[PDB]
Amino acid sequence: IVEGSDAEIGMSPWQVMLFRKSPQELLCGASLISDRWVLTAAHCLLYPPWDKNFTENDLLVRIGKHSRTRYERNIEKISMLEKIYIHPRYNWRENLDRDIALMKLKKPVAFSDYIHPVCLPDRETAASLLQAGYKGRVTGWGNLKETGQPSVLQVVNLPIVERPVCKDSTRIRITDNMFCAGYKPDEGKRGDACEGDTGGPFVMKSPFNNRWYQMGIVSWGEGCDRDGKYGFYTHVFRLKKWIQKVIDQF
Amino acid sequence: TFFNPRTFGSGEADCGLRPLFEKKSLEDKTERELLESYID
Ligand SMILES: *C[C@@](*)(O)[C@H](CCCNC(N)=[NH2+])NC(=O)[C@@H]1CCCN1C(=O)[C@H](N)Cc1ccccc1
Ligand SMILES: *[C@@H]1O[C@H](CO)[C@@H](O)[C@H](O)[C@H]1NC(C)=O
Ligand code: NA
Numbered sequence: 508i509v510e511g512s513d514a515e516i517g518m519s520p521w522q523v524m525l526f527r528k529s530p531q532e533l534l535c536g537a538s539l540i541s542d543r544w545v546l547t548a549a550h551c552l553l554y555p556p557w558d559k560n561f562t563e564n565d566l567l568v569r570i571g572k573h574s575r576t577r578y579e580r581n582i583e584k585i586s587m588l589e590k591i592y593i594h595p596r597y598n599w600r601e602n603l604d605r606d607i608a609l610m611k612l613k614k615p616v617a618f619s620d621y622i623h624p625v626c627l628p629d630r631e632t633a634a635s636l637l638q639a640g641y642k643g644r645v646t647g648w649g650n651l652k653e654t655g656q657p658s659v660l661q662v663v664n665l666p667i668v669e670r671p672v673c674k675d676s677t678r679i680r681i682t683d684n685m686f687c688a689g690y691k692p693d694e695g696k697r698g699d700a701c702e703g704d705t706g707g708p709f710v711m712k713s714p715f716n717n718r719w720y721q722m723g724i725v726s727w728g729e730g731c732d733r734d735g736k737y738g739f740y741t742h743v744f745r746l747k748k749w750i751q752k753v754i755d756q757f
Numbered sequence: 758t759f760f761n762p763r764t765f766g767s768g769e770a771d772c773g774l775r776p777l778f779e780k781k782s783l784e785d786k787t788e789r790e791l792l793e794s795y796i797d
Binding site: 627664719 | 759761765768771772775777778779786788790792
């Protein structure tokens with residue numbers, strides 16, 4: 508997260524850290540959506556140009572964390588994965604269309620002050636909240652700038668940007684399964700996600716029921732926090748039928 | 758409730774309410790920014 512700030516303790520209790528077993532390394536962010544399901548980006552797990560094709564056994568999930576590097580005894584919980592599901596039309600060769608994956612935990616995690624699931628939007632909430640100019644929030648342990656890495660979870664709030672502006676900001680082909688967010692050059696304020704933040708949630712708080720909803724997943728961008736450039740996010744509601752299928756069937 | 762908790766597990770009913778914030782009637786340091794963006 509570039510130009511963000513330290514999260515408060517328990518500010519983002521649905522935040523997950525994907526961690527590689529060997530060599531031990533932070534891989535990306537993810538979000539908790541129930542006691543046993545985790546949502547992340549596909550490219551975290553499958554991106555052959557970067558030698559990423561992880562199986563269930565290469566990874567663990569660390570939940571309830573604040574510190575990037577410390578093991579936080581009696582606060583964080585670590586789970587193994589039972590199964591990984593990537594969207595079957597995930598397009599890593601071109602534009603990361605449908606950059607989405609689900610992970611089933613081997614055993615459910617206990618909720619706590621530090622661990623708690625985010626909501627996924629219904630249609631009315633998606634229509635209502637996913638509008639240009641409305642702000643959501645992005646969290647992660649990724650880079651603080653273009654390359655470094657933070658001591659603790661970072662947070663930033665960013666406005667949703669209109670599709671024409673998103674389209675004209677890049678030569679990469681955008682689809683209806685993505686949205687972009689970030690300040691325009693004329694707005695003065697700054698902030699963006701960055702490398703290492705992929706998979707982390709873009710959340711918005713509903714003024715109708717006071718609940719946090721995950722509208723997006725950190726997917727891609729060109730550089731970090733550049734003027735005239737925006738972060739792209741997987742459009743969660745657009746893929747909710749796939750999410751439902753996977754969960755209902757498995 | 759959208760998902761079946763037999764396969765989804767528990768937590769949907771109470772989703773999106775943070776123990777240290779909403780549940781304690783405490784506001785976090787920047788969430789007013791989000792709320793104010795809706796007035797605009
Ligand atoms: C994998 C994630 O850590 C990372 C998120 C970057 C978010 N950046 C900003 N400014 N919000 N994603 C990436 O690094 C993805 C994965 C593949 C390459 N990539 C990019 O964002 C490139 N910089 C641009 C791109 C290349 C191919 C297809 C789509 C986008
Ligand atoms: C990655 O792993 C699968 C098995 O899990 C393998 O069959 C496949 O060829 C690999 N995927 C790609 C896109 O190379
Ligand atoms: Na920008």
